[PDB]
Every structure is written in C-alpha cells, then in structure tokens.
C-alpha cells in the first residue's frame, strides 16, 4: 500500500525540504509534510493495478487476418496495433511468456499451425506442409470454445528487444536492417479452415504473462507510421503534388493563452 | 570540487553536482552466472579504461543538439578502439563527463541524457531503414541540425528533430533516462556513470550501439553583457570495466 | 460422474481474466535470465520521475 500521511505542525527549519535542484538528475523527495501542515490519514490505497504484470497482462489484440481462400498467415508481432505497441515501448527490454487466444467468426473446423522459425510455412490450404510431424498444431471448432496456448519466452537473449540501436550485418553490407526486425522472430501462425461455413475474420488476442520489464523509456508522443521502424513523419498523400510534405501526428494540444487556463 | 581518476587520466571539476550512477548500478565485470561464451575474455583495465575526450562542439544560438553513439564514438580512440575492432564481442560500462562553462553573465541549459538503445527514426516518409554510416559517425557525433521539411532524405538519414528525441518520444520525458542538466547559472559539468545495459552479456561493438549520449540546448545561450555568442561543449567518455572476448582479425576494410 | 454445473461466465473469453493455458512447445527451456540494470516493476515508478511540463503550449 501507499504510505500514510504523517502529521506535521508549523516548522521553522534552516534546511529547506523544498528547495532542491533540477540539475542533479534526481527527482524530489518532497512530501506534503514539507509544504503544509498535514494531519494523519490512513491510506489503504494500492498501486496493484499499476505493476507491469497488471499493466501489460491484459490480452491485447496483436494482429488481425482475413482468410482469403480458406487460408490466413500472420507473423507474430506486437507491431501492427498501436495501443499495445505504445505500452510495450514504455520499456526497452521485456521478457514475457505469451498466451495466444484466437477469436474467429468462422463456423466450422479450423487449424492453427505455429510454424517455428527457420522452415517453410504452408503457402495455402490443402498444401502438403500442413501434414507435419513436429510443427505444433492446434485443431479446434470455433463454436463451443476459443483456442488458447502459451508460447513461452523464445528469445535468444535474456529479453526481447523493444528497441535495438544496431544492425544485423557489418559496415560494408547493403541490405542492413536497423531495429528489432532481425533480433527476434516469434514464428508465425498459419490458419486454415477444413470447412467452409462461417466468416473469414480471425483476431489474435495475445496476453503477456510472467513479465519482467528492464529499462523504462518515454511514452511515445506521436502516431506510428510503419512497423519495426519507429518513424513518425507521416506521408499522407502520395499522388497529389503536395506529396513530399510530412505530417507530425502528435498529441500536444494548444491553449489560447498561458496564465489564463 | 570533484575528482575522477581512471588510469592514465584524471577529471577535475569545481562547480559540480552529484555524480549520476545510471540505474543505481556500477559497471561490473561479467559474472560466470551471466556469461554465455566459453572463452576467457580479455581485460585491458588500464589502457582502455581511461578518459577519452572527443572533439568539442560549439553551442551557438540556434544549435538544436548533438548526439554520440556508444561504443561507436570510441572506435578510433586508443586501445579501447583497437580491442573493439579486433574482437567479436565486448561489454563496457562508461563514465561520461560533459563540460561546458561560460560565465556568470551567460544563460542557458543543456539536458545531457544517456539513452539505452536509441533507435533513431528515419528523417521522414517511406519505409526506409536508416543507414549504417549515419548512425555511426564516430567521435565527431551528429549535430542535430533541427527539423525542417527540406531536410535531406538520401540514404537513410536519421531524424533531425530534437523535440521528439529523433525516435518519436517527447523531450522532457527524456528525464526517465540517466540525465543531468548543465544550467550555466549553477553548474558547468555533468558526470554520468553508466553500467553495461543490454539484454545479452556481450555483443559486437561495431554492429550494436548500446548507449547514446544526447545533449540538447533546452534553453538558448544568451551572451548577456559579454560579446561571446558561442561556448564549446567537450565530452570526455571513459570506458569502465570493459572486457572483450572472441579475438579475431581486425574488422576494418 | 461427479456432478458439476457450468454457471454463467464459464464459456466466455474475457480479456482481463487470469487463467492457465496449455503450454505449446513443451520441454522448451528458455534462455537464462541475466542481471540487466534498471528493472522496473511498477509503472508508478515511471510516474514518480520529474518530467518537463510543456508550459508554453501555444500555437
């Protein structure tokens, strides 16, 4: 729980507990007992909805797909949806197991195949690579139940990179890849239907659990433009001859006059 | 009054604050419980762990900022740079001392932050990865040169806007990072001691830049009654507890 | 068998619920956890850091 308010009477001190210095890079220790005369207040309030396990462990939508010809394909990434991407980019390194719930409006018999990295995924339904001996696969009927499975921490590191300031190739290379694109791939999920009846919309709701967040970062103050790319200059119109202008898409609102709000 | 000595070098200051120790941890050596590679790492310990002072940048009026990637900036600085070019992996803490002093007639501020994994944005538009040459400028750093719609976009140029920290996250929230402010009214220097921050024990020091020291002129440089309109900023970076493993040929061209 | 009942709220997928789930890839050994400096356990510790107010937000 949060600390209680301590009582404080009138104080005439020579060491001020309210004159600090912003330049030292340390935040203030100032409580309300320094500035005013407080009373005792029993504070039973908690921040148990603000820890990383409760802040991030909520089952956000990570990706949408649409079955075109009884087939969908989604590579596992938190990068297509901006609301979970902002919450992950609060931090630099995140180590989490993830449970994956599939919400499909298809009626019939579906198959998910978690293709691990390094092999060819099935390029269609009725493909031969759906018949696999070792690729973990999930058969389910979407009526009477949603499927759910935990993918553990598959990292090649102690944590996932939310941000990477590096490249996968040395200096002389030409197809260099900035960012977190080469550092980790969580496989992909290949969807197919063995029936035909219902709809085509497949939603993938992924919940991070057993989370360990490692370096805090500023929350993003601009809308995302691409994925794996951290850009924020939105190029809105490609056709018309205002093409090379770039919107900013930030959230800082303006007030008409300071000292009047 | 302050004094920081790492071998064959010494930093001295007069009007200095508390030293910032980044995330409460000192730079350490890689423990055997946290190591992955099998070979014995090297430990230079006196000729690499020393204060290398980079080139001075000029804080004029209209200067938007500078940034130096680490350990990219020390790639030609002494035997730390030679051990970086000759080894497959490496880890290092850093002690970053930033010096800018003008007068009691000058005004201004400098937020001096150390960003782990400063993945810079593209300068704008299409889905283009930023270049290797533009995020590895050496000890010369990168003058931030301000936002404009007329900025060059040829070949993965990095973002030039200091307000969005050139990755889209707002300045002023940059104080979540290990930082200090050089306010010329009160102090003139800023020492930040950073441990090795990575989710991996050692990595290639040329491909990956772990830290990125960023200096932004928060408040402009007023000269006051004095005809000096621009004051140099010098950045003195010392590796600390640097180790390297997997020796190999020099990774130059 | 043992008499059970399935009351309302059993076959529902709530996003913010806390349930156990079958581990795909069993026998998977994750990579080891090293000491990375700066571990944050509560986002209020991010909220307690001094951060600059944009006090001159005019147009």
């Amino acid at each position: 729980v949060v600390p209680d308010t301590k009582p404080s009477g009138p104080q005439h001190t020579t060491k001020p507990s309210i004159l600090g210095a912003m330049e030292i890079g340390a935040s203030s220790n100032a409580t309300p007992e320094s500035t005013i005369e407080t009373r005792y207040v029993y504070n039973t309030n908690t921040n148990a909805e603000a820890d990383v396990e409760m802040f991030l462990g909520r089952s956000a939508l990570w990706g949408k797909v649409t079955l075109t010809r009884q087939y969908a394909k989604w590579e596992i990434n938190f990068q297509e949806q901006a609301h979970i991407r902002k919450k992950f980019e609060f931090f630099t390194y995140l180590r989490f197991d993830m449970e994956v719930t599939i919400v499909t409006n298809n009626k019939g018999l579906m198959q998910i195949m978690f293709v691990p990295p390094g092999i060819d995924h099935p390029e269609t339904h009725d493909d031969r690579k759906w018949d696999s001996a070792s690729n973990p696969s999930v058969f389910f009927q979407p009526k009477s139940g949603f499927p759910r499975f935990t993918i553990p921490f598959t990292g090649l590191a102690s944590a996932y990179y939310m941000f990477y300031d590096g490249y996968d190739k040395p200096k002389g290379s030409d197809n260099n890849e900035y960012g977190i694109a080469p550092t980790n791939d969580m496989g992909l999920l290949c969807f197919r239907t063995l029936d035909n009846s219902g709809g085509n919309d497949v939603k993938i709701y992924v919940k991070p659990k057993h989370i360990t967040a490692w370096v805090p970062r500023p929350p993003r103050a601009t809308q995302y433009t691409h994925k794996y790319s951290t850009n924020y200059h939105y190029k809105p119109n490609s056709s018309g001859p205002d093409e090379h202008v770039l919107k900013d898409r930030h959230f800082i609102k303006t007030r008409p006059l300071i000292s009047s709000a | 009054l302050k004094q920081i000595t790492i071998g064959n070098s010494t930093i001295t200051t007069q009007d200095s604050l508390h030293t910032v120790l980044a995330y409460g941890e000192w730079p350490t050596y890689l423990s055997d419980i946290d190591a992955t590679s099998v070979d014995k790492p090297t430990h230079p310990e006196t000729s690499a762990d020393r204060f290398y002072t980079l080139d001075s940048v000029e804080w004029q009026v209209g200067s938007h900022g500078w940034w130096w990637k680490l350990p990219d900036a020390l790639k030609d600085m002494g035997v730390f740079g030679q051990n970086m070019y000759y080894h497959s992996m490496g880890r290092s803490g850093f002690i970053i001392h930033t010096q800018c002093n003008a007068t009691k007639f000058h005004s201004g501020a400098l937020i001096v932050a150390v960003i782990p994994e400063h993945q810079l944005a593209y300068v704008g538009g299409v889905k283009v990865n930023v270049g290797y040459d533009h995020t590895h400028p050496g000890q010369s750093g990168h003058q931030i040169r301000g936002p404009s719609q007329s900025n060059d976009r040829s070949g993965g140029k990095p973002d030039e806007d200091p307000l969005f920290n050139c990755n889209g996250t707002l300045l002023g929230n940059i104080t979540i990072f290990p930082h200090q402010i050089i306010n010329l009214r009160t102090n003139n220097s800023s020492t930040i001691v950073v441990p090795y921050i990575n989710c991996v024990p050692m990595d290639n020091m040329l491909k990956h830049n772990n830290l990125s020291l960023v200096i932004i002129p928060l408040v402009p440089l007023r000269p006051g009654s004095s005809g000096i309109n621009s004051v140099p900023i010098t950045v003195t970076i010392a590796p600390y507890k640097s180790e390297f493993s997997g020796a190999m040929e020099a990774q130059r061209q | 068998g043992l008499p059970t009942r399935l009351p309302s709220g059993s076959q529902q997928f709530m996003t913010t619920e806390d349930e156990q789930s079958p581990n795909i890839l069993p026998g998977f050994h994750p990579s080891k956890k090293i000491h990375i400096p700066g571990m944050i356990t509560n986002v209020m510790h991010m909220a307690r850091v001094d951060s600059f107010i944009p006090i001159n937000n005019i147009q």
């Binding site: 030292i24 805090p216 | 980044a22 | 156990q20 307690r48």
Partner: peptide, 25 residues
Amino acid sequence: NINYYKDSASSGLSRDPSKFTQPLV
C-alpha cells in the same frame, strides 16, 4: 494454487523506486 498443466510457463499472472528519481552516488 494448483498448476493444472505441470509447467511453469502454463501458469497465470505472477506477482524500489530509487534506481530512478535518485540515481546519485
């Protein structure tokens, strides 16, 4: 507190400020 799947990853959700707000020496 039962683990119905006999795996550590299969469980539910699991459970100091001064590294920030005062990172001094």
